[PDB]
Design a protein around this ligand. Sequence first.
Ligand SMILES: Nc1nc2c(ncn2[C@@H]2O[C@H](COP(=O)(O)OP(=O)(O)OP(=O)(O)O)[C@@H](O)[C@H]2O)c(=O)[nH]1
Ligand SMILES: Nc1nc2c(ncn2[C@@H]2O[C@H](COP(=O)(O)OP(=O)(O)O)[C@@H](O)[C@H]2O)c(=O)[nH]1
Ligand SMILES: Nc1nc2c(ncn2[C@@H]2O[C@H](COP(=O)(O)OP(=O)(O)O)[C@@H](O)[C@H]2O)c(=O)[nH]1
Ligand SMILES: Nc1nc2c(ncn2[C@@H]2O[C@H](COP(=O)(O)OP(=O)(O)O)[C@@H](O)[C@H]2O)c(=O)[nH]1
Ligand SMILES: [Mg+2]
Lengths: 432, 42, 58, 430, 430, 430, 49
Amino acid sequence: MREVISIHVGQGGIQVGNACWELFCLEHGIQPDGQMPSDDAFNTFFSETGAGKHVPRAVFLDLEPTVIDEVRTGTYRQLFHPEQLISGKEDAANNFARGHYTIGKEIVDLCLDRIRKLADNCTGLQGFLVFNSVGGGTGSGLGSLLLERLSVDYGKKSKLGFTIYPSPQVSTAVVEPYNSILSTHSLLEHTDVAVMLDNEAIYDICRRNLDIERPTYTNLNRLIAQVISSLTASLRFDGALNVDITEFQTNLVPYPRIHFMLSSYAPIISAEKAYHEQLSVAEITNSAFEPANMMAKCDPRHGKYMACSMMYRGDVVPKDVNASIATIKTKRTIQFVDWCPTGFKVGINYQPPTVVPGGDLAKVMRAVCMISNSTAIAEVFSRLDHKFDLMYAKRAFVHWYVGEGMEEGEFSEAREDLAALEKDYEEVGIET
Amino acid sequence: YPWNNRTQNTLLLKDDVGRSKPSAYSLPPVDYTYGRPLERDE
Amino acid sequence: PQFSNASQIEVGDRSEVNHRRFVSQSKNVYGNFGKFDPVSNPGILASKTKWHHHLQSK
Amino acid sequence: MREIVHIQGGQCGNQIGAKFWEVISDEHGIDPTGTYHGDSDLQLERINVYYNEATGGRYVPRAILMDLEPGTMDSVRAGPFGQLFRPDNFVFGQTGAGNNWAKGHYTEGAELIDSVLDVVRKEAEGCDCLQGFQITHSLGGGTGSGMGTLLISKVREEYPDRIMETFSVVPSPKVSDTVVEPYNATLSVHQLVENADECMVIDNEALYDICFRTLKLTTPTYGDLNHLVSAAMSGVTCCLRFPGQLNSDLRKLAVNLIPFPRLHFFMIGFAPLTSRGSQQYRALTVPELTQQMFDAKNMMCAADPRHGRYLTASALFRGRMSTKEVDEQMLNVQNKNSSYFVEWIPNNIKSSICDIPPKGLKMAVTFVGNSTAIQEMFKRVAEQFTAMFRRKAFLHWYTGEGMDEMEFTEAESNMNDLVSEYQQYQDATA
Amino acid sequence: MREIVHIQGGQCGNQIGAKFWEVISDEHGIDPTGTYHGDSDLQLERINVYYNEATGGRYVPRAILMDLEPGTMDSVRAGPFGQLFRPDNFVFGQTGAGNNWAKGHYTEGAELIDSVLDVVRKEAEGCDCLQGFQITHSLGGGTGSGMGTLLISKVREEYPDRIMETFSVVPSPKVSDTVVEPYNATLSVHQLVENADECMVIDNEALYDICFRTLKLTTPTYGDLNHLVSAAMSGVTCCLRFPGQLNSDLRKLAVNLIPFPRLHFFMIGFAPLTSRGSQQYRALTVPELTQQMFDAKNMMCAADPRHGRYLTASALFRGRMSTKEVDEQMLNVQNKNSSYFVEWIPNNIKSSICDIPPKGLKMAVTFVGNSTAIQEMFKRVAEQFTAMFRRKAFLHWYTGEGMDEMEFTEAESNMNDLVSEYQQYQDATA
Amino acid sequence: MREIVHIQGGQCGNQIGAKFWEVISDEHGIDPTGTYHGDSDLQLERINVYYNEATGGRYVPRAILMDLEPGTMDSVRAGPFGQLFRPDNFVFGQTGAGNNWAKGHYTEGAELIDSVLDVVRKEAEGCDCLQGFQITHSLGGGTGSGMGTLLISKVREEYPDRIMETFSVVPSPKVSDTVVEPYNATLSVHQLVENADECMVIDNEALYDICFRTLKLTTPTYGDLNHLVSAAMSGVTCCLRFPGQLNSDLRKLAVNLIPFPRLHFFMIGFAPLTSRGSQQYRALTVPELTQQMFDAKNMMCAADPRHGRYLTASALFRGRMSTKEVDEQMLNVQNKNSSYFVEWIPNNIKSSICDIPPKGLKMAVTFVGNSTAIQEMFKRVAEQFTAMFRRKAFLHWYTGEGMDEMEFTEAESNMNDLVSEYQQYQDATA
Amino acid sequence: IEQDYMYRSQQDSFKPRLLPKGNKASDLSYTYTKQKLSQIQQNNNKELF
Ligand SMILES: Nc1nc2c(ncn2[C@@H]2O[C@H](COP(=O)(O)OP(=O)(O)OP(=O)(O)O)[C@@H](O)[C@H]2O)c(=O)[nH]1
Ligand SMILES: Nc1nc2c(ncn2[C@@H]2O[C@H](COP(=O)(O)OP(=O)(O)O)[C@@H](O)[C@H]2O)c(=O)[nH]1
Ligand SMILES: Nc1nc2c(ncn2[C@@H]2O[C@H](COP(=O)(O)OP(=O)(O)O)[C@@H](O)[C@H]2O)c(=O)[nH]1
Ligand SMILES: Nc1nc2c(ncn2[C@@H]2O[C@H](COP(=O)(O)OP(=O)(O)O)[C@@H](O)[C@H]2O)c(=O)[nH]1
Ligand SMILES: [Mg+2]
């Protein structure tokens, strides 16, 4: 009766989305061809064809056929409806202007046509999920367009955006600061919640916990899919304390402007042959709060916490969480803002996390997923502002954007929107 | 044996012409009724 | 003298057979699901995972 | 889709093109009779980028062979793999150009150019969604340096939006073939700077140095230099023709490599290159690949990259590898040689990965670098050109065919302005 | 008690046999007059494997000496330890082979083998329970390659269950002294693979290689080279003659080294080997022995084993030590060099221990390895054969005794198939 | 047991190393025949650090000798203690470097180092647990500076975690004995800063000055100077071999003495040094020892430390004493000379005590200091470099065999940057 | 071209037949073993004349 629709745009969104749908079918027993071998939890992410197979509630968007036909020729060709794999003709080529004012308008009409065709079939929509890598043209340009259009088409409907912000020092492009600044203004007021998912932190977790010296994009997407699976596990599985999507953004958002999140997951256990350990609730919670364990390159000890949402799945007893939470508060390195005396919300689900056969993670009876709001998140905006400062000062690469539908103005208020946003975090965190 | 437009590998190798597009995944054999059935109340 | 261009720089060493030359990472890593008897012995799972990862890498 | 047509001009262009088409056919499993002989199904996945379908299943390239002398076409056709090309695309004159830029750009070009425009526009209307144009030529000759740049200018005129890149073999001073090399080279540079979207310069001296040092072969021929050029040039469209982790077509490269519209001259290099008597040991990993990539002697230009500062760089990785190592190696290279990188362009290296390695190799890397070192090769040509213009000798033939010294005067001034503004950004500080 | 008989042919075979019997006699304390001189009773416990019993308490070897020219047998009699051999066992021809495979295999070999086959048949019956045969001959000579391979054919016919081992010396292209060696080498190789259970390749080039660099003796002679082979020859059958912590005979090695019956060509090496002025400086330990055992330059074949993959390997340790030094080191060497061992046969190495070291040594190791890198010496030999055969050079001698060119054609195909079969198994994955 | 291997190259390394092994053998009670004849049981507890035991009970040093000519290797073999070195550890060419950096680093060094790298690799893995490397060579010469620095680079990429020490004889203009010193002095310094963890520079003029004034020897020789250097070498690793109160190994020295990665150049000294005719007329006490070891004229470098400020110093006391005096004297000298120690680091002197002094002595001290006064050596060398590089004199030899003036500019530029940053902290305040 | 592709397609579909069964002396020993082991019983079967 409850349904959620997922939207994938850009190569970054497509690849991370491929891992998620691999994970979800394993949880619900769906074969890669979609046919059940040998209930009704699958209704959240799947729609019955009438007799037999199931169809995911997703649509794929990109301006290059290279990724889309790979899905259409891979092992998951049997699963998707043929028209939700929207394919373009020419790429934006890391050009925000092309993906926003030049070639994005010939495909956005087709998407919204398919968007409505999935919403009317369902009845109890909770929110939308959109995946994209902000450091690209079509990834950010189309994402900004979709959010703006969906804002007036639906209005009060919840939307979740799991953006992948550029890393502090490593990157694959050279003009990615330009796209990130422009898109951030668009999504500052068009999405209900967003999370920080930069690449360096995921590299650090893989190198440290998994002890893998050969990490690639396949491993990163698998970790992200685990956060997604735990995040929506309360919607399709019976739990001691059920918490819904609308239960999230009414509790983690003090003011409408401040709705940027960061994630952490624990435990991360390699696939070795040791006896391992029981991994009690008290110790898995401690690892979730480790500054180095956060899935974003943000130091929580550099700021103050505002709110925290923690999800436990396994056989966790509410008393153990309550004892563990009390101990965390007493620790001096973790502090909260004065005007927020209580800042913890907990959800418990009975279904244990699943393991992908052939994957890197192992089987564990306890796991925790964390989403928190902290004053320290102001540091990432400052560094991209400085990076974009040295860029726009001598007006480099600008003429490419100007000649493709952009004028000189938008770089101006994009500066001030972040400057206003940065000042907002500074004034919220000050003592009363 | 995937020579040009001869045997099923993918739509790119198909590039069918003339009347329609060839069968792709498996399809039901001949005359399966498509869609959710109805008209039941017990 | 040999006519035309007659190039012999031979950029590839050759004589090496690569049966998995055209197996993409995006294709192979996400869809093996091979063997993995649902046994509850951690050692069996670890040995199978090590062998599977060796086969994937090689 | 997003296809690219090929037009090769001059003797140098045809020599490049023959080996390039042989290399592409070998990569895609095509015999010299146009019959498919591939083993994997990814070989026909994007064959339409360069090839077309003929009756019976024969594949034909979209190459256009054009020149002023029939001696090149009847040799390239008699050579191997010459049956692929359609004779309709074989267009040539009968009087030649005599390596005279004025002649091949003014006198006989005006009437021969109609046929080549007709055939290229026929090819462009035949292709579904055009992506760009590629042209191979040299600036040391007359027919190439003149006719090719005239064609480039007007095809840009009817296609102002589509990208267009060309490969140029600029003449070198230590090994000089023609006495009038500065003149036509300067003219071609002036006519090409405002027309070509991307330009790649190749020095024949650098090819000789590479083949002598790392190949350790005592007797090089024009086939081996063409082979190096063809490999480096076919490495560019690897992610356009095959799936990869981070696909980056020609348009993606253009945005990330050119900071200012008048700065689009690049040097390229290829790796790995092992000796012929190489022992069978180990395997190529990332650190040695990137070390040989950033090695200065590996560059295909006489300009020394250590003489200037890199504006930006691009690497095209071939093979099956992870992504963390390439990024950390690029960061390591930047941190080690920050003195060679201008400081107002943070993280000025782009990385791309293609999952299909070249046949017979485990790993390969293609480098495209926009560095401030090209000012030397402009400066040395300019010094020769001014000395050979003050003499006013060999000038009467150029001036007696419709032009005069005004074009030379405005060309040298414009090229000097290019060098001045190019050094301006090198000396600029953050 | 599972004794073996010795057969040696040709000039090279006689010299290998002459020096080999000296080493065995010294090992078991037998003087040149055939009388026991030893100290311990262990030297007489298993004396029956090599020496028969005669009157007066003297022993005579069960070795058959054959040649097509009696000058070799006159020389072997006048050398040291020349009185041990029974005069009846010498069977010789009065014409000679003249470095011709055809003459020694069709005309002179056929007419003479009746006598020698009677002698070896008589020797085999005398023993209570035969263990096998061992052969020492050169594949480049006339009588050794020609008649030697025909006797193997006849012996295999009448004694099927018994095992046959051959220490064969093939000529290398570097040190070459016979123009017609490619013909008689390849012809024997085709015959050898048909019947011989085990073949061990020896190259004069490798023996020279060891002497100049390892032992550092300025002017080696043929006696020095014969000494190295004799040391390895006695080592392989050591545990059959002495007790030990782990037993292994010739049959056991054959089982654990031959996955497929067509793949029975091994390489051998002996350790330790030290110069005269360096024995005071090296500490003899198992890690030192194992390190030298897998050294590529230590092999007695021109084939480099790092160019292929070890299908199987075996080690026979001689001396007193604990099993931990043995077991741990073989495990360690397999882990550190996992790229040089084929994957589909895990734990492809065998270890044996015998507690009787040689005289003057406290530890010694004999190594027998089956590798696919041995195919390259066959390719080099076949390369020289096809170069000479297309012009039919030196062919009228070979056709003069009835042998026709179809056998020459048959030799090429079978040799190429053997080479291809090695290549197939090297390039195979699970 | 955290043993260290020794590599000595050039003429200086061979002479210094030969004298070094004489002192250590005397300290450990080992005769020139290699048989132990020591006195106390303490001399065998850690003998594995510097020696390897061979079968038979003789100890052989683990040292590798390097040269491009046999001129100096034959003399050291024929000299005293020349039978200790294993003959397999002697590697040499037959041409020589001729005081040319590129010959020993590009043409002859590259071809020869393949053999020696095998010797070092075998030596390193043979022992249980490495502790590091120590190098003795010269920077003003051809084979020592050229091949020597190449091996530092080669071993660094293979053992990135192990420590590495150098005892470098940098040239001083007062003792002018080579006309090409400034060229190959800068090149070696440039390569030495990215790989070596600890560098200890030595000057002949400083060594000559000590002999004339302190020892009051009317006429010294290289034998005397080589002994003083060898004395400092043994004192550094004193706590690594004998029991003490505050043990300090090589790594503990680097941690306390290196504040920044590029500041690892040190100046050393030894005490007590006393003339033969005035030894019995003065007392041996800690106040006397500490007075001489801070004397500006006692160190092995011509630079005056009173022209700069110390960053960190270390003193390694030996013998029987009381820790109260050691701690009090260090504090006393740090307070009365507060102008010579940089303020923003408190207590920048480390002390260590070892109970066993050198034979025949009661107490001894080795002083290792890190001061900004070492910029004078690099400042003065750079001045001579640019004075000679300005006219491009003595340049064609380098550029004629694969060397280019580019990295001459790079080497001079980096060293000049090192000078600027090294004296920057002299003026820096908290 | 059609006939060329017919020939190549029909010839390319046959390859995975290895079954290593080289038997030159091994077959002789194998036959000897069968002969002795089977004929000992037949020798202890004949009726006297
Ligand atoms: N975690 C993760 N991030 C990816 C992956 N692929 C791409 N990215 C991110 O995407 C960013 C750059 O965007 P692109 O790869 O160009 O994708 P895009 O934003 O859709 O732009 P286009 O290439 O034009 O489609 C990089 O900084 C990466 O962080 C992936 O497989 N996993
Ligand atoms: N690298 C390379 N250079 C070539 C080749 N053919 C000719 N050249 C160079 O081109 C120069 C002459 O150019 P030219 O033939 O006059 O150009 P054209 O007038 O357009 O035909 C000579 O200096 C050659 O070194 C080739 O196949 N490869
Ligand atoms: N290793 C070794 N090789 C030998 C010896 N005597 C001869 N040879 C080699 O055998 C080759 C000649 O073989 P040949 O005497 O004609 O063989 P035959 O005709 O069978 O007697 C020469 O090239 C020698 O190198 C020996 O005592 N030891
Ligand atoms: N202290 C000392 N200095 C030496 C000794 N031998 C040579 N030198 C110095 O080394 C310098 C010459 O270096 P050289 O041997 O030519 O270097 P190489 O050619 O690389 O081996 C001279 O200036 C000498 O002062 C020695 O035994 N002791
Ligand atoms: Mg893309």
